[PDB]
């Protein structure tokens, strides 16, 4: 009933689309993704996201973070993240496996620009990693 | 003690069911049981009383032409309650003639059954006396007639056809009659086309969704409510277009284009919208086939931006360059239209199938005129729209390459024969776009003498140049210099008196083919000097002006001259043979035209 | 007993200190002494209570990543007072990085420096190891470093080039780090294009200053007021434009083009205006480079006025007269564009280099054709602009001289051949603007006879005149009299029977080039009499009317006859030679057309 190949292609196209659309926001491309910044360790940045449950909890945290930033572009990107999380639930249903389901304000208030630019470049990295491992037999 | 019940109401259903309702006492914190008494003032007066725990009661088989009166009282269900006072009675009266059902709304291929209890002079005639007529025009065949009972007449339509609208009558109005005695009562059978094509477009920023749709067929029924109903299912659309039970209405407004257009904003992008047009008609609700869409699949393809159309130097192609729009992200087909600039344009079209190609080269008949080019793009799979044609792109007039063949030039003599220093007016013509390619920037006449060697003087854009020839021999080569260089193939013409007396033509004659055409015949002598070509010089005889020359190959014997010939004037045909060393003596004849 | 202190406040300074300020007891009519205890829970815990007579206190050299608990109590300063209770303690928590200062808001070309305190594991690292980065791009050069202290590191920026934008940010981001590991907080460098060129112009009436400036850059940081500031120096602009301490604001209004314009009236024509833009922001204030303007130097030149164009008498030159514009009074060169009057004007330019010349003269081809002429003026030194084109000058259609040439006329014979006195009907044709100037009042036929002498008869504007020729010899001349006089050149044609038999044409031939083109040749006999010209008379063969004539010069053997000939009717062509002594004998042929 549900064609899985269409879902993989739509997943790839939406990921590539969100990364390029966010890629049009010029000030983030010149910011080093791998440079470590003390204080934003709660943001699930590059730290092996090697399981379906880790991807799900990562996108859940990212959703919770994006929900508090008042930009419209990020709100739709968050909507795409919602479609993506529901899609990852559908993919786990395809492979058969169950999926279960604060300090942000302080850094948002004291340093919003740094927090946003890093959070966004880390989001781009998370999507690039999931993509780079969405073919090496992803497992729940 | 509880208060008396209030809000008494009564209604009659289609089949003949008597529904009695009353408002429950919410102020009472206890359940209430209601004693309801009804007095049926029918042809025989009856009275009854019942006790019901609920707030509704049913009395089946409503008698035609009969009155009904209802009164209600209430009492506490639990405990030693006290019966409340009786409420206000309600009285109602019924009607005679019956249809089952009054009307039917359906589509093609249905099995519509109709019945009528037909009253003739207060008597229900037999079902064999009831005859059904389609719009009082053609009797319905009795094969479709059926006998539910003697007093109920039945007609049936299996595998219905589309009830084609007759004027404002989209339905069929069946009349059941006492044979030739027809009442005014009729039953309406509707078949309505609902197939509407909806075009939806997602904005160029991925924030809002805009849908347009044309109610082309539905502009035939009025008084009913026509609206779009959408339901958002979490992911994508169901593989079978279906109606989810829960749905919401969408506010949409008609615009001057004839399409209802409305916007969802902000958007839930892969979150499927199943919409369809519901039409609350008097008979029910006609529903268009539920069409579900994923908005991401109907994004607008923007007209491609920053297209430059120019001329490729040294190749003569039409180069077009562009960039992909912001959206979409799938592969794209591209269409290009191009033509010569002007009020009228002959549009040539080409298509590109690979999205990686951001540049293209094209062939065009004209190489050096202003060109207008416009671009559009669509999704390669076509699941979308064709973009608006881009803004016009104008090429710049630049030379493709150096010219190929040089201009043909000849000499005009001014001065006395004994006066050696004579004015030679070199006269040529501008090259064609095949020789000059795009244009000739300037003309350079390079001279050659045994004294001054080889030297050149720049002429400008003029095709005439008068220079004082003094030496016994003087060579001239005219070069057409474009923005890149001079013409490749060029002709050299030498002027020299001593061998200007050299003969090369034996016989020459002319014949007036017409006032516009003349044939020139000549036989040549064996040439000792290398005869490159000839120059026919024709002018009005016994005059100075009217001087016109044409170059002729030396390898031919026949020629045709076309001009506005003047038949009164004899014309001096002066065929000048041209050699490698210089110009030979002309063969001069005189002949009418 | 004093009220305990309220409104405790404390802030980290730009120079890495802490200032504590709190609200005093307003209701107390007596001075107050304040004991303020700070608990610095830094890398080293330090609880210390200080005493202040005022409400301000400072703590220096803050330790990064530290808590601070601030408590205040108050007491009556004079008398046997009692110390009041503590105020509310307040807690600050510092971070890993301290900036000196956090941010700078300034203009292009300034000198801006920072200092850094970087914590790492509660160890203030050496200034030799503190290194900065601008928005995480590249390492600041070492020459721009400095060591105020081993912990307070320093960076310096000289010759600040304006920060070209990187996204919607309006600053450079800065982190100072222990090389490879550092903190979240970001330092802002606000530098924008402050060098602005506000264009100010004087109105043509010298009563208005209008200044426009485009704020394309400022509309990126919000919350800052913007205004125009200016000062007026008494006379002229000093070579160094600078802000005098007295400054005044000017109200200005935005327009549709996004420019702010400022409107000033009345104007001090010689007072120098030193002008700039003030931007008052929360961080601080910025001022555009002061520029001084002197109004007379920005005056748009006024068009020349009172322009009348007329054709000069007896010469045909185009004389244009105008009055100099009121301002400026300096010498001006005049560019005069001129051409025909119509939709398209072939504009040609005349250059006048003396201001005193309020009128000039030029050359034209037609001497009564309406023209469009305009004049503009520029300052002689070129300091200024080009004035608007003067009022379009138009020339009147009027004759300037006597006519140059009289009309061409020919004779028609009425009467029998034998009888002496025949009716000569002279037919001429109206004269165009080439010989008749532009109008003719009348035609005068001056006779010349051996018996009646010479007499002139006025025929008005008629092109025909029938007169009885009686004498053996009769010369006739036609003069075109305009409003100013008679035509200069006037053909004289003599009538004489003895010379009416004098033949001057050997042969005459005609060929039908087309229906409207009849081509005619003739060979003439050796003429003894003084022959002026010939007259071609063509008419349909054997008719009374259809009679038509043209004047051919006798020097040619060609004539194109362009007329609505009837193909089916053969035309009789008569060539009449014209002599001083009389009309010669014609040659008559017949030919198709």
UniProtKB/Swiss-Prot annotation, chain A:
Q: Name one GO molecular function term.
A: peptide hormone receptor binding
- Where does the record say this protein resides? Secreted
Q: Which InterPro entries match?
A: 4_helix_cytokine-like_core (IPR009079), Leptin (IPR000065)
Question: What does the UniProt entry report for the null mutant?
Answer: Mutants are severely obese and sterile. Animals have an increased bone formation leading to high bone mass. Have impaired T-cell immunity, Th2 responses are favoured in mutants. CD4(+)CD25(-) T-cells of mutant mice show high levels of autophagy.
Associated disorder is: Defects in Lep are the cause of profound obesity and type II diabetes.
For this chain, the family text in UniProt reads: Belongs to the leptin family.
Instruction: State the function annotated in the UniProt record.
Output: Key player in the regulation of energy balance and body weight control. Once released into the circulation, has central and peripheral effects by binding LEPR, found in many tissues, which results in the activation of several major signaling pathways. In the hypothalamus, acts as an appetite-regulating factor that induces a decrease in food intake and an increase in energy consumption by inducing anorexinogenic factors and suppressing orexigenic neuropeptides, also regulates bone mass and secretion of hypothalamo-pituitary-adrenal hormones.
- The name this protein carries in UniProt is Leptin
Report the source organism.
Mus musculus
The organism's lineage is: Eukaryota, Metazoa, Chordata, Craniata, Vertebrata
From Swiss-Prot, chains B, C:
Q: Which residues lie on this side of the membrane: Extracellular?
A: 1-593
Glycosylation site positions: 41, 111, 197, 280, 388, 423, 434, 452, 461, 464, 492
User: What does the PTM comment state?
Assistant: On ligand binding, phosphorylated on two conserved C-terminal tyrosine residues (isoform B only) by JAK2.
Annotated disulfide bonds? 116-176, 177-182, 200-211, 237-292, 252-262
- Tell me a GO biological process for this protein: regulation of transport
What is said about its interaction partners and assembly?
Present as a mixture of monomers and dimers. The phosphorylated receptor binds a number of SH2 domain-containing proteins such as JAK2, STAT3, PTPN11, and SOCS3. Interaction with SOCS3 inhibits JAK/STAT signaling and MAPK cascade.
Tissue specificity here reads: Isoform A: highest level of expression in lung and kidney, also present in heart, brain, spleen, liver, muscle, choroid plexus and hypothalamus. Isoform B: highest levels of expression in hypothalamus and lower levels in brain, testes and adipose tissue. Expressed by neurons of the parabrachial nucleus. Expressed by peripheral blood mononuclear cells and CD4(+) T-cells. Isoform E: expressed in adipose tissue, liver, hypothalamus, cerebral microvessels, heart, and testes.
Annotated Ig-like domain ranges read: 95-193
Q: Where is the Fibronectin type-III domain?
A: 4-97, 303-398, 403-495, 504-593
Q: Which residues of the full protein are shown?
A: 235 to 827 of 1162
Q: Provide the function of this protein.
A: Receptor for hormone LEP/leptin. On ligand binding, mediates LEP central and peripheral effects through the activation of different signaling pathways such as JAK2/STAT3 and MAPK cascade/FOS. In the hypothalamus, LEP acts as an appetite-regulating factor that induces a decrease in food intake and an increase in energy consumption by inducing anorexinogenic factors and suppressing orexigenic neuropeptides, also regulates bone mass and secretion of hypothalamo-pituitary-adrenal hormones.
Keywords for the protein's UniProt record, in alphabetical order: Cell membrane, Disulfide bond, Glycoprotein, Immunoglobulin domain, Membrane, Obesity, Phosphoprotein, Receptor, Repeat, Secreted, Signal, Transmembrane, Transmembrane helix
Name of the featured protein: Leptin receptor
* Membrane topology of this protein: Single-pass type I membrane protein
Its GO CC terms are: basolateral plasma membrane; extracellular region; plasma membrane; receptor complex
Please list where the region (Leptin-binding) is annotated.
231-248
Protein location: Cell membrane; Basolateral cell membrane
Q: What is its main location?
A: membrane
What remark about domains does the record contain? The WSXWS motif appears to be necessary for proper protein folding and thereby efficient intracellular transport and cell-surface receptor binding. The box 1 motif is required for JAK interaction and/or activation.
Q: Which gene encodes it?
A: Lepr
A single GO molecular-function term is:
peptide hormone binding
Q: Which family does it belong to?
A: Belongs to the type I cytokine receptor family. Type 2 subfamily.
Motif WSXWS motif positions after renumbering to this chain? 386-390
């Amino acid at each position: 009933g549900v064609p899985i190949q269409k879902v993989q292609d739509d997943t790839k196209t939406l990921i590539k689309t969100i990364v390029t659309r966010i890629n049009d926001i010029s000030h983030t491309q010149s910011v080093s993704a791998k440079q470590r910044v003390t204080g934003l360790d709660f943001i699930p940045g590059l730290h092996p996201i090697l399981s379906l449950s880790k991807m799900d909890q990562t996108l859940a945290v990212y959703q919770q973070v994006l929900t508090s930033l008042p930009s419209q572009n990020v709100l739709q990107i968050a909507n795409d993240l919602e479609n993506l999380r529901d899609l990852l639930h559908l993919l786990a249903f395809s492979k058969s496996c169950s999926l279960p389901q604060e300090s942000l304000d302080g850094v948002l208030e004291a340093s919003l620009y740094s927090t946003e630019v890093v959070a966004l470049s880390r989001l781009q990295g998370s999507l690039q990693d999931i993509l780079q491992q969405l073919d090496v037999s992803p497992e729940c | 003690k509880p208060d008396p019940p209030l809000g008494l109401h009564m209604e009659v259903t289609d089949d003949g069911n008597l529904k009695i309702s009353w408002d429950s006492q919410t102020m009472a914190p206890f359940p209430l049981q209601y004693q309801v008494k009804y007095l049926e003032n029918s042809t025989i007066v009856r009275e009854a009383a019942e006790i019901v725990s609920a707030t509704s009661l049913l009395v089946d088989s409503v008698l035609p032409g009969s009155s009904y009166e209802v009164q209600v009282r209430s009492k506490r269900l639990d405990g030693s309650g006290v019966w409340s006072d009786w409420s206000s009675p309600q009285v109602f009266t019924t009607q005679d003639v019956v249809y089952f059902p009054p009307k039917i709304l359906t589509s093609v291929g249905s099995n519509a059954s109709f019945h009528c209890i037909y009253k003739n002079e207060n008597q229900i005639i037999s079902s064999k006396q009831i005859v059904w007529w389609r719009n009082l025009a053609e009797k319905i065949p009795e094969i479709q007639y059926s006998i539910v009972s003697d007093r109920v007449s039945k007609v049936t339509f299996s595998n219905l056809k589309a009830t084609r609208p007759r004027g404002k009558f989209t339905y069929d109005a069946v009349y059941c009659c006492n044979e030739q005695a027809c009442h005014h009562r009729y039953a309406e059978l509707y078949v309505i086309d609902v197939n509407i094509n909806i075009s939806c477009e997602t904005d160029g920023y991925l924030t809002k969704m805009t849908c347009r749709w044309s109610p082309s067929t539905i502009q035939s029924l009025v008084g009913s409510t026509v609206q779009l109903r959408y339901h958002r299912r979490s992911l994508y659309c169901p593989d079978s277009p279906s109606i989810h039970p829960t749905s919401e209405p969408k506010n949409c407004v008609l615009q001057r284009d004839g399409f209802y257009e409305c916007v969802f904003q902000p958007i839930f992008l892969l979150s499927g919208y199943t919409m369809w047009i519901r039409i609350n008609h008097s008979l029910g609700s006609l529903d268009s086939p539920p069409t579900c869409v994923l908005p991401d699949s109907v994004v607008k393809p923007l007209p491609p931006s920053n297209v430059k159309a120019e001329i490729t130097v040294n190749t003569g192609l039409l180069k077009v360059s562009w960039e992909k729009p912001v959206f979409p992200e799938n592969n794209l087909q591209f269409q290009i239209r191009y033509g010569l600039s002007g009020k009228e344009i002959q549009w040539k079209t080409h298509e590109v199938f690979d999205a990686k190609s951001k540049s293209a080269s094209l062939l065009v008949s004209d190489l050096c005129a202003v060109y207008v080019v416009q671009v559009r793009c669509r999704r390669l799979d076509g699941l979308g729209y064709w973009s608006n044609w881009s803004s016009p792109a104008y090429t710049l007039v630049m030379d493709v390459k150096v010219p190929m063949r040089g201009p043909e030039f000849w000499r005009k003599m001014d001065g006395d024969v004994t006066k050696k220093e004579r004015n030679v007016t070199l006269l040529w013509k501008p090259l064609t776009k095949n020789d000059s390619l795009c244009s000739v920037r300037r003309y350079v006449v390079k001279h050659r003498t045994a004294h001054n060697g080889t030297w050149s003087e720049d002429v400008g854009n003029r095709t005439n140049l008068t220079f004082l020839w003094t030496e016994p021999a003087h060579t001239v080569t005219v070069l057409a210099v474009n923005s890149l260089g001079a013409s490749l193939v060029n002709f050299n013409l030498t002027f020299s008196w001593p061998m200007s007396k050299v003969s090369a033509v034996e016989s020459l004659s002319a014949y007036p083919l017409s006032s516009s055409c003349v044939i020139l015949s000549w036989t040549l002598s064996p040439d000792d000097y290398s005869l490159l070509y000839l120059v026919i010089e024709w002018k009005i005889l016994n005059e100075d002006d009217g001087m016109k020359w044409l170059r002729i190959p030396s390898n031919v014997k026949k020629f045709y001259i076309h001009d506005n010939f003047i038949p009164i004037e004899k014309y001096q045909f002066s065929l000048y043979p041209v050699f490698m060393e210089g110009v030979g003596k002309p063969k001069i004849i005189n002949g009418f035209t």
